[PDB]
Design a protein around this nucleic acid. Structure first.
Ligand SMILES: [Mg+2]
Ligand SMILES: [Mg+2]
Length: 134
RNA sequence: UCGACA
DNA sequence: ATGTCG
């Protein structure tokens, strides 16, 4: 039913899938951009959606913030709950970068605790997530 | 069937 | 329109 305005919204942006991946986190209320990751030459949508949520967890934890995080990605929300990113992306020299980030994010989740609620953004009811690249 | 990314 | 990540 209602939107928690006091929250962080994250989203992935890509050119191709697999292709160039970036992601960002914004204040759900204002759209202020709080963080934006530099483009990764090759990655998948779901790897970027996963990295964006874990980045968000780290970002809120470091700031002593209890805000929830919104993502529109059912996949990535589950990966974070599992502490495991089940991506099909081949491992090679070109995908080394994003696979290192993904392994590091998983290791962060295995070494830290959080109470942050990770919430599904209801695109069908509320329109595009406010972190959308549009 | 559904959630995304193009 | 057609394609890929889940
Ligand atoms: Mg998304
Ligand atoms: Mg989007």
């Amino acid at each position: 039913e209602e939107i928690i305005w006091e929250s962080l919204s994250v989203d992935v942006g890509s050119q191709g899938n697999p292709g160039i991946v970036e992601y960002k986190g914004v204040d759900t209320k204002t759209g202020e951009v709080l963080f934006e990751r530099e483009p990764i030459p090759i990655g998948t949508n779901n790897m970027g959606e996963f990295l964006a949520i874990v980045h968000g967890l780290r970002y809120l934890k470091e700031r002593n913030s209890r805000k929830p995080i919104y993502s529109n990605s059912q996949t990535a929300i589950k990966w974070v709950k599992d502490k495991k990113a089940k991506s099909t992306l081949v491992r090679n020299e070109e995908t080394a970068l994003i696979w290192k980030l993904v392994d590091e994010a998983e290791e962060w989740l295995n070494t830290h605790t959080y109470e942050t609620p990770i919430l599904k953004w209801q695109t069908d009811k509320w329109g595009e997530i406010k972190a959308d690249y549009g």
